[PDB]
From a paper:
The increased abundance of late-PCs (doubly capped with Pba1-Pba2) allowed us to resolve the structure of this trapped late assembly intermediate to 2.3 Å without, and to 2.1 Å with C2 symmetry imposed during 3D reconstruction. The symmetrized map, however, was mainly used for data interpretation and confirmed the immature nature of the trapped assembly intermediate based on several criteria: (i) Pba1-Pba2 chaperone complexes are attached to the distal α-rings; (ii) two nearly completely resolved molecules of the Ump1 chaperone are encased in the complex; and (iii) β5pro and parts of β1pro and β2pro are observed. As previously suggested by our cross-linking experiments, and in part consistent with a recent report, the 148-residue Ump1 loops around the inside of the cavity formed between the α- and β-rings, contacting α1-4-, α7-, and all β-subunits except β6. In contrast to previously reported precursor structures, the N-terminal 20 residues of Ump1 are well resolved in the late-PC structure. In contrast to previously reported precursor structures, all 75 residues of β5pro except −65, −64, and −13 are resolved in the late-PC structure, β5pro reaches through the pore formed by the β-ring to the α7-subunit and is sandwiched in between Ump1, β6, and β7, presumably helping to coordinate β6 and β7 incorporation during the last steps of 15S-PC assembly. In the late-PC structure, the β2-subunit has undergone autocatalytic processing leading to the exposure of the N-terminal active site Thr1 residue. Nonetheless, a part of the cleaved-off β2pro (residues −27 to −12) is still resolved in the structure. Of the proteolytically active subunits, the structure of the β5-subunit is most divergent from the mature state. Similarly, our late-PC structure shows disorder of the S3/S4 β-hairpin loop not only in β5, but also in β3 and β4. In the α-ring of the late-PC, α3, α5, and α6 are shifted outwards, α4 is shifted towards α5, and α7 is shifted upwards towards Pba1-Pba2 by up to 5 Å.
Numbering used by the authors:
A (entry chain 4): 1 to 40, 42 to 81, 117 to 220, 222 to 276
B (entry chain A): 8 to 243, 245 to 248
C (entry chain 5): 2 to 156, 161 to 267
D (entry chain G): 2 to 205, 208 to 245
E (entry chain E): 1 to 247
F (entry chain D): 1 to 240
G (entry chain F): 1 to 234
H (entry chain B): 1 to 51, 53 to 249
């Protein structure tokens, strides 16, 4: 190249190109807030609840755990209409709340409201809480609890996992115990992981969920490489 | 602040200005060095202040005065890399003029050529101007002693005498006062040594400081050659 | 009692300035509260500490995590400061954020002065609010008691003249597209605005994007020198937090690449 | 300010004060490199380099941190390794071309000017970046011994003693002291001893390093660039320690 | 410690901090936006099968060509952007014909696949050092089924990254996940051609939203004797009826 | 959007190229065009904006252009880009006839037009054609009708009946309800009537804003006059 | 945060003086599998662990032959490895055709460094993101070189690159005196390399499908062993 | 291949104005005043040689001969004017002199200069020129003519006009002082009067530049012997002549 384009100057990065709720930007009114309906499921029947995103689907094999669908959390937004469905899964005596993120089409406000509703509903019985997520600000896998933080500045967690942790820590119903597992790129709903991090996630998830390492590792390894979201171009780009 | 695409390229601001050109002008004063040029009856003298505070430097390799051709000499105000770039370009231009037209290139024509190149730099988006000011001196076979100056804006003009640098205003005022007293546009002397001594004295009076043999560089253009004096020559000239 | 509110603007200059303010005078500042981050991008992270070795602003022993929006309090000067980690999920919710979060806090703590910090990018000046480009900073002041005539009225576009800027500021009017116009409209049109609130001050700077640590420090120096906040004392030390050591990635990653640097 | 915001995201751009911040950032990159020094003696040059101790797996004779541009020119650099290798290759090409054309080894000032023009040409367009290396080179020609230092801006100068890298300040202080204490001059072997001493002083926090010394002297090496052999290197190391 | 936007995923020549090229990942996503294609390799030939996804009933079903012939002994199935696939198919046909012209022999399946991957590399530096030819990577993936005397029957998967793999069975497109999961369990080295065809039809029916029939699905095979042939509608309908009767 | 829609060479995180979608949006603003093929003919219908009172109508270009004596072309989108595309198609038809002695087939010409449109999406310094085209005809020495649709991205498809442009969804639904592939209109009159009735679902004024062109085998292209279209409209209204 | 403003391309320095795109290109190497190289005074050996997409796929070729006397193994980006291997083959072919010479290993390393440096200082392209291990035998004996895509080459008795290569590198450094004197016995050197690469295994075992070996020597042309040919080494 | 093109440096604003052309016009308005007056038997072109006191005024001239019968002056940026003058002198020979054996008429050379200036606005490599030109000339079939050329490349003929910093007041004075029976000497006097109100400092022959297009000058031809060889009509008045006219 003889030159770089003169008009190719970077734009300020302090603003995030998130989707807009209403097409009118000069309005001075109050924007509506989406409402979340939590279906009524016997919460005391389950002793553990795991909250994560769809990118962690391979960590929960369907055949081995006998995953069963109970109900759907409903989310509705009306602007002068957006509707979202949140499936809830259950295996053994463990509940599973897996949320799908999409920075292109889904605003973080839905995730905030969903996290608030889930934490408020689960705080009525104080069950075991496990959170599984990823962050692009950390350098290695992190294990955290309610009384210990392994993050060093300036690392942090954002997104749906960040909302859930915020509701657990500084929410009105705070003080609940939890175990959080965070793995080390990409926008929300389009993240990628390394093979080593995926294996570490499998091992730690198996240890925390109480399963035989061999069969669980084989099932998760098979699920990861079946064109999962986080295994996009690993095999075809690196040798 | 340019406040727009003019922060990088040479385009018009809403006020109608080219900020990159003005910033190159500001860059011309980085070295904090003053130069003076005067004309005699049959010679032209340039004197440049030399500042070498570092003890590890070799003073003999520190110079802002260049020999462009047999008869043309050049003094540069600004950073030394752009100065050397301009010096090589000027040498090539003078040689090409001699090859193409059969006679030696005059000082004013070379100044105009460099000014046209600078105009190219001011108008092209992907070319930056050089942050230097050039002063060509000679004894032209038709015009006699000659001083011409070119700037990053592409502007060039000739002078009876000139001064360039952070302290150029005082030197110019002193020169104007002397010329008003003498009512002539040149120095009435027959030997270039006397012109060199007069220019040294003028620089000392204008700057208000004393100079040794290692604090100055002197170049003299006669009708035959342009040559640079050494330390011994300057030391001899100081004693007067 | 004055509350310092930064805005998420070009270069993150106000937020960085807050990091300059709290860390340089950590002895006078303590963590007070965590506001609701409903309309922000939610944030969870560790507790930041000054580099010089001073005690953490979080005096609570069992506290281990920080949130997106946190309010710190200075008892000696009686000054509130807001630290914000993430921007709003959308601009449309800005009207909510001032009304449902900031105004209840102002009412609760009976704050008598609000100072808003902001930065502007000159290439985006579509309405030409910049009239004196040679000036870097702008300051505007508004008083309810003095402006009694304008407060009581019925209510010519793309510009607003409510604020009173100093003659040495780079602007005399604000644009309707700027967030500050919406914030001011929500504050003035609020029915339940606190009666203790009397002065609204707005400090803005002009800069570009990049490493704006020194720019933020100079902006804070200008704010302090102008005595915008009466009780703000001058800063001499200017200590950074430890998190800024991770600005360019890992602290000791340069020695890792032995095939590049030697 | 050391950070020019709004004027540091593209090469060949002037700031309102007339500065070029990309060249300054390349200088910052240079300042984090390994310490290298050069001393000009009565009739020659001496170069000294501090090296980090690497794994034993490296072949001892195939890892040399002092480059030979030509039979009479020695060179060291601080900054980016690939940029230094590129510049040394260009210098070798220029020396070979000059020797082929004019049947004589290239004088040091002409070589310095060619290198400086090449480096300066990389501060003119936004499609390239300035070199992230500072180079100390030198040698012997018909006019005597010459030592030069060249910077990312393309500016170069001749030096009585030059230093670059992390420990540049201490090395420069020692070089200034050496110049002050020897107004008459200095010999090649005394220069080698002083270079060893200066490298040792500048190193002193992970006290584990090696020292490389090269020299070109009319009386010692007949105006050729040669590495210091075992006996002289051991003597210099012992003198530096004691 | 603040949240700011990152823009490392916009330029194809820009690395992420961990060393990724996200434009290639997004091209793979574009591939996943396409319809399903399945290939199964046996010792009696290789079977390819695609789903014909029609937005409107007015579209001519006999016009969608997701299976093409590169040469008499090499066939291909595509998934992704159609124009990129058209360019790649033109290049592959040219390579095969030219190799026949210059060497008087059939080109190896792996050699043709390597040539296609070298073409796909053109968004950067070429395999032989050629200058850049494309502004963006391709958004289409290929399944190349061939037979040569050197290596028998072969099935290859070719991606826009310029890398190809050899597969016993492979699936690409929208339903590639469940289809590949079924292939991992239902493939063995002793499959016959008829069993492979039935398995392809079954897996296509499993991962197709619409009801499987001759109109919305297409089958093809390659054998040493007959070469590469795409089945007509009648034969596929008979196979579907046989599969229905078996199940 | 979200920063992924400022260039043709940028993939979206979900695998989209938004500038192609925006070119399709530009196509959506043009007047509606319809193509319906029967048992032995192809009919292209076009919506025309109401002519102004002072607008000349004798030399106004038609919406249906003859690429060759056996192939015709209609378009929807930017009118000015369609002229460039039509000129290139005519040149290519003549070039193919010269090179191979044989006139092009409909599929070959469709592929060439799609190739031109694809080529105009392969550079950051060029703008794609905001035009979608319908190409109809019969292959030489053949009697099978051919109808194809081409898009700005360079993708082309084969249809039994298709609509493009403004309000094309309603016309497409009408065609889907009122067209049977296994029993196409066996006569030219039935195909023309179906095309006119489909166009009447979105044309406001009526007959004067409808253009109909009929292509038969053996290079038989007829542009129906306003009187015939008016008769068809009146018959449709009477039968309604 | 501040790094995010100065990592756009390869022609931009950070205010602290860092070139982040080259650092990212170097980081891209660890995304590849582990490869090991070693040598003695008479032979040079490469050992590679190969990976497959799944059980239905084949394994990637990590060892590529450049000439009868020289070869290499790769770790990192596949397109860059393909380009560099083809370039080295072209250079060896040119040497043989024009001078009837066998290209020296050091000359190949210098050529690779020169080619790689260009992409790190100009706009328009990107730096290479693959590391290479080159083995060969020429008139100076046996040679092993490590190439880093920033444009760097080092000469070593043994090394390892790729994910988790630190264990293999530590094992090689600890036992340098053992394999440095294995002259005339290729099997012992290959076994030492296999043990070294086994030192870097994590919950995996070497099989006849994921193990690749290569050897060059005084009278031994560059030879690659795959499949059953490595069965006796497991 | 992103280096095969460069996006336009001159684009339309939403209001429908080309910003770079307007800014070049602004730069023209900040320049030194230059005027032109057309008479019945000649044309006068005048400018102020605003400058350092140590600079030689005769070395730098703002009035240039384009052809022996056509001259020009400018307001704005000097280097752009110098480049344009060199190009115009070359074009007078390339397009006309080497084709028809004659020098071009005034309007055609003005058109060539205007086209060159216009091409600078349809570019991704250069910004438009920042000068405004006044071109005066004489030709056999059109008589005397005076034209003004703007940075956009538009040109218009004038009976009398002025450009630069004091253009409005000079235009008012010329409007109040122009008639169709004016003579060349009267035009020179009016030009001096108009320039008197614009120059702030010393107003003598060393700070004013005047040129005329009048009758042929056989003394400036340089040779004798051919009766049909007309002398040049362009003539630049010396400082002494300007002083003599000012004193009178």
């Amino acid at each position: 190249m003889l030159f770089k384009q003169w008009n190719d100057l970077p734009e300020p990065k302090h603003l995030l190109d998130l989707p807009e709720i209403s097409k009118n930007l000069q309005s001075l009114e109050v924007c509506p807030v989406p409402k979340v309906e939590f279906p009524q499921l016997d919460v005391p029947q389950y002793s553990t609840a795991v909250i994560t995103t769809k990118i962690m689907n391979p960590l929960f094999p369907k055949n081995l755990l006998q995953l069963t669908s109970i109900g759907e959390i409903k989310t509705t937004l009306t602007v002068k209409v957006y509707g979202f469905s949140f499936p809830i899964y259950s295996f053994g005596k463990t509940l599973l709340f897996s949320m799908e993120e999409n920075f292109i089409s889904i605003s973080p406000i839905f995730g905030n409201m969903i996290s608030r509703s889930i934490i408020s509903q689960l705080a009525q019985f104080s069950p075991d809480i496990i959170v599984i997520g990823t962050s692009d600000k950390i350098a290695s896998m992190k294990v955290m609890t309610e009384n210990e933080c392994t993050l060093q500045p300036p690392e942090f967690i954002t997104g749906f996992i960040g909302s859930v942790l915020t509701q657990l820590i500084v929410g009105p119903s705070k003080g609940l115990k939890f175990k959080c597992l965070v793995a080390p790129e990409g926008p929300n709903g389009f993240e990628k992981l390394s093979l080593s991090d995926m294996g570490s996630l499998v091992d730690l998830c198996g240890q925390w969920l109480g399963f035989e390492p061999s069969r669980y590792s084989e099932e998760c390894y098979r699920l990861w490489r079946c064109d999962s979201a986080a295994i996009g171009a690993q095999s075809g780009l690196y040798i | 602040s340019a406040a727009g695409y003019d922060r990088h390229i040479t385009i018009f601001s809403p006020e109608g200005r080219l900020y990159q050109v003005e910033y190159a002008f500001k860059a011309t004063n980085q070295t904090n060095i003053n130069s003076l040029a005067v004309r005699g009856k049959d010679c032209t003298v340039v004197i440049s202040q030399k500042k070498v505070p570092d003890k590890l430097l070799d003073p003999t390799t520190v110079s802002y005065i260049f020999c462009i051709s047999r008869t043309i000499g050049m003094v540069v105000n600004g950073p030394i890399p752009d100065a050397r770039n301009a010096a090589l370009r000027a040498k090539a231009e003078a040689a090409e003029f001699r090859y193409k037209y059969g006679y030696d290139m005059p000082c004013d024509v070379l100044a105009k050529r460099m000014a046209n190149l600078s105009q190219i730099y001011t108008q092209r988006a992907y070319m930056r101007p050089l942050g230097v000011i050039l002063t060509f001196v000679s004894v032209d076979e038709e015009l006699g002693p000659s001083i011409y100056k070119t700037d990053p804006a592409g502007y060039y003009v000739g002078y009876k005498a000139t001064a360039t640098g952070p302290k150029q205003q005082e030197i110019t005022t002193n020169l104007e006062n002397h010329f008003k007293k003498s009512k002539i546009d040149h120095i009435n002397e027959e030997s270039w040594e006397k012109v060199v001594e007069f220019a040294i004295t003028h620089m000392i009076d204008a700057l208000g400081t004393e100079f040794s043999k290692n604090d100055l560089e002197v170049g003299v253009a006669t009708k035959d050659k342009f040559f640079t004096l050494s330390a011994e020559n300057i030391e001899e000239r100081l004693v007067a | 009692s004055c509350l310092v509110l930064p805005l998420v603007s070009v270069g993150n200059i106000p937020q960085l300035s807050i990091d300059w303010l709290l860390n340089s005078q950590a002895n006078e500042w303590e963590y007070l509260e965590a506001l609701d981050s409903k309309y922000l991008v939610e944030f969870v992270g560790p507790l930041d500490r000054p580099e010089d070795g001073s005690d953490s602003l979080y005096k609570d022993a069992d506290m281990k995590y920080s949130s997106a929006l946190e309010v710190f309090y200075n008892k000696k000067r009686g000054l509130f400061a807001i630290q914000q980690r993430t921007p709003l999920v959308s601009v449309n919710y800005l009207n909510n954020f001032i009304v449902e979060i900031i105004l209840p806090f102002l009412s609760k703590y009976n704050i008598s002065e609000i100072c808003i910090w902001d930065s502007l990018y000159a290439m985006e000046d579509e309405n030409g609010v910049i009239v004196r480009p040679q000036e870097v900073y702008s300051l505007g002041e508004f008083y309810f008691d003095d402006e009694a005539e304008l407060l009581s009225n019925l209510h010519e576009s793309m510009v607003n003249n409510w604020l009173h800027f100093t003659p040495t500021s780079f602007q005399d009017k604000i644009s309707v597209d700027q967030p500050i116009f919406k914030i001011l409209f929500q504050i003035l049109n609020a029915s339940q605005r606190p009666k203790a609130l009397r002065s609204i001050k707005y400090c803005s700077c002009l800069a570009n994007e990049g490493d704006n640590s020194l720019d933020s420090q100079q902006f804070l120096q200008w704010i302090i020198s102008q005595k915008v906040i009466k009780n703000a004392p001058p800063i001499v030390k200017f200590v950074r937090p430890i998190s800024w050591q991770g600005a360019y990635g890992m602290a000791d990653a340069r020695d890792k690449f032995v095939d590049l640097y030697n | 300010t050391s950070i020019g915001t709004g004027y540091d995201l593209s090469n060949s751009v002037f700031s309102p004060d007339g500065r070029n911040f990309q060249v300054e950032y390349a200088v910052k990159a240079v300042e984090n490199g390994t310490t290298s020094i050069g001393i000009k003696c009565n009739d020659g040059v001496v170069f000294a380099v501090e090296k980090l101790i690497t794994s034993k797996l490296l072949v001892p004779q195939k890892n040399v941190k002092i480059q030979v541009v030509d039979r009479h020119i020695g060179c060291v650099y601080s900054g980016l390794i690939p940029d230094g290798r590129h510049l040394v290759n260009r210098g070798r090409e220029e020396a070979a071309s000059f020797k082929k054309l004019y049947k004589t080894p290239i004088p040091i000032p002409a070589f310095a000017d060619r290198l400086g023009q090449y480096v300066q040409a990389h501060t003119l367009y936004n499609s390239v970046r300035p070199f992230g290396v500072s180079t100390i080179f030198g040698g012997v020609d018909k006019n005597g011994a010459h030592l030069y230092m060249l910077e990312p801006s393309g500016s170069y100068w001749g030096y009585k003693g030059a230093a670059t890298g992390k420990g540049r300040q201490s090395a420069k202080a020692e070089l200034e002291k050496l110049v002050d204490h020897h107004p008459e001059g200095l010999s090649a072997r005394e220069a080698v001893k002083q270079a060893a001493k200066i490298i040792y002083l500048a190193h002193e926090k992970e006290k584990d390093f090696e020292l490389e010394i090269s020299w070109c002297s009319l009386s010692e090496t007949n105006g050729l660039h040669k590495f210091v052999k075992g006996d002289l290197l051991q003597e210099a190391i012992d003198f530096a320690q004691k | 410690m603040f949240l700011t936007r990152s823009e490392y995923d916009r330029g194809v020549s820009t690395f992420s901090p961990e060393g990724r090229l996200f434009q290639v990942e997004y091209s793979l996503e574009a591939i996943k936006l396409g319809s399903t294609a399945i290939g199964i390799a046996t010792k009696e030939g290789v079977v390819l099968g695609v789903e014909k996804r029609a937005t409107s009933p007015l579209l001519e079903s006999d016009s969608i060509e997701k299976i093409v012939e590169i040469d008499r002994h090499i066939g291909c199935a595509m998934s992704g952007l159609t124009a990129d696939a058209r360019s790649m198919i033109e290049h592959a046909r040219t390579a095969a014909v030219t190799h026949n012209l210059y060497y008087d022999e059939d080109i190896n399946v792996e050699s043709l696949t390597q040539s296609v991957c070298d073409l796909a590399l053109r968004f950067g530096e070429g395999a032989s050092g050629e200058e850049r030819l494309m502004s963006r990577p391709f958004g289409v993936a290929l399944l190349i089924a061939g037979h040569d005397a050197d290596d028998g029957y072969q099935l290859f998967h070719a991606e826009p990254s310029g890398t190809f793999y050899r597969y016993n069975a492979k699936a690409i497109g929208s339903g590639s996940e469940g289809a590949q999961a079924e292939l991992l369990n239902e493939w063995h080295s002793s499959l016959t051609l008829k069993e492979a065809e039935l398995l392809v039809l079954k897996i296509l029916k499993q991962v197709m939203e619409e009801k499987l029939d001759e109109n919305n699905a297409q089958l093809s095979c390659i054998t040493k004797q007959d070469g590469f042939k795409i089945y007509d509608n009648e034969k596929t309908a008979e196979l579907i009826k046989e599969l229905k009767e078996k199940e | 959007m979200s920063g992924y829609d400022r260039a043709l060479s940028i993939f979206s995180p979900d695998g989209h190229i938004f500038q192609v979608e925006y070119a399709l949006e530009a196509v959506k603003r043009g007047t509606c065009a319809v193509g319906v093929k029967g048992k032995n003919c192809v009919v292209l219908g076009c919506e025309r904006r109401s002519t102004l009172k002072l607008q000349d109508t004798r030399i106004t270009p038609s919406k249906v252009s003859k690429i060759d004596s056996h192939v015709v072309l209609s378009f929807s989108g930017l009118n000015a880009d369609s002229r460039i595309l039509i000129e290139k198609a005519r040149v290519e038809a003549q070039s193919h006839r010269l090179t191979l002695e044989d006139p092009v087939t409909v599929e070959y010409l469709t592929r060439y037009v799609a190739g031109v449109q694809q080529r105009y999406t392969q550079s950051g310094g060029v703008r794609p054609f905001g035009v979608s085209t319908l190409i109809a005809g019969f292959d030489p020495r053949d009697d099978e009708p051919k109808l194809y649709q081409t898009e700005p991205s360079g993708i082309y498809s084969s249809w039994s009946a298709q609509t493009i442009g403004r309000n094309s969804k309603t016309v497409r639904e009408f065609l889907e309800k009122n067209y049977d592939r296994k029993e196409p209109p066996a006569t030219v009159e039935e195909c023309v009537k179906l095309t006119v009735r489909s166009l009447l679902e979105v044309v406001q004024t009526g007959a004067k804003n409808i253009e109909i062109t009929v292509v038969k085998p053996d290079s038989d292209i007829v542009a129906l006059s306003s009187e015939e279209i008016n008769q068809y409209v009146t018959q449709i209204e009477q039968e309604k | 945060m501040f790094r995010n403003n100065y990592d756009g391309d390869t022609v931009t320095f950070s205010p602290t003086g860092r070139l982040f795109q080259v650092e990212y290109a170097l980081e891209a190497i660890k995304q590849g599998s582990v490869t090991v190289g070693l040598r003695s005074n008479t032979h040079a050996v490469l050992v590679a662990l190969k990976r497959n997409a799944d059980e239905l796929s084949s394994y990637q070729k990590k060892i590529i032959k450049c000439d009868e006397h020289m070869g290499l193994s790769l770790a990192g980006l596949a397109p860059d490895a393909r380009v560099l291997s083809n370039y080295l083959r072209q250079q060896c072919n040119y040497s043989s055709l024009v001078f009837n010479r066998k290209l020296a290993v050091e000359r190949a390393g210098h050529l690779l460094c020169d080619k790689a440096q260009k992409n790190t200082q100009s706009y328009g392209g990107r730096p290479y993101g693959v590391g290479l291990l080159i083995i060969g035998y020429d008139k100076s004996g046996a040679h092993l070189l490590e190439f880093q895509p920033s444009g760097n080459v080092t000469e070593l008795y043994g090394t390892a690159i790729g994910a988790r290569s630190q264990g293999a590198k530590t094992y090689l450094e600890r036992t340098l005196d053992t394999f440095i004197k294995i002259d005339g016995n290729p099997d012992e050197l290959i076994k030492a390399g296999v043990e070294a690469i086994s030192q870097s295994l994590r919950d995996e075992s070497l099989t006849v499908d994921n193990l690749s070996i290569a050897i060059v020597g005084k009278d031994t042309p560059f030879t690659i062993y795959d499949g059953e040919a490595v069965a006796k080494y497991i | 291949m992103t280096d095969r093109y460069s996006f336009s440096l001159t684009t339309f604003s939403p209001s429908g104005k080309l910003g770079q052309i307007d800014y070049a016009l602004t730069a023209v308005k900040q320049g030194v005043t230059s005027l032109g007056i057309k008479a019945t038997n000649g044309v006068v072109i005048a400018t102020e040689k605003k400058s350092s006191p140590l600079a030689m005024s005769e070395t730098l001239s703002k009035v240039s001969l384009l052809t022996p019968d056509i001259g020009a002056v400018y307001s704005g940026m000097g280097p752009d004017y110098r480049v344009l003058v060199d190009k115009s002198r070359k074009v007078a020979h390339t397009s006309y002199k080497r084709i028809y054996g004659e020098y071009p008429p005034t309007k055609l050379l003005v058109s060539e200069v205007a086209k060159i200036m216009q091409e600078a606005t349809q570019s991704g490599g250069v910004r438009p020129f920042g000068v405004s030109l006044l071109i005066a000339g004489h030709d056999e079939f059109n008589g005397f003519s005076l034209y003004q050329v703007d940075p956009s490349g538009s040109y218009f003929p004038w009976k009398a006009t002025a450009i630069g910093k004091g253009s409005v007041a000079a235009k008012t004075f010329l409007e109040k002082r122009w008639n169709d029976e004016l003579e060349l000497e009267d035009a020179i006097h009016i030009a001096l009067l108009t320039l008197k109100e614009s120059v702030e400092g010393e107003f003598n022959g060393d700070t004013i530049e005047l040129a005329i297009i009048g009758d042929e000058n056989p003394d400036l031809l340089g040779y004798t012997g051919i009766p049909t060889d007309k002398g040049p009509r362009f003539r630049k008045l010396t400082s002494q002549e300007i002083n003599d006219r000012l004193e009178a």
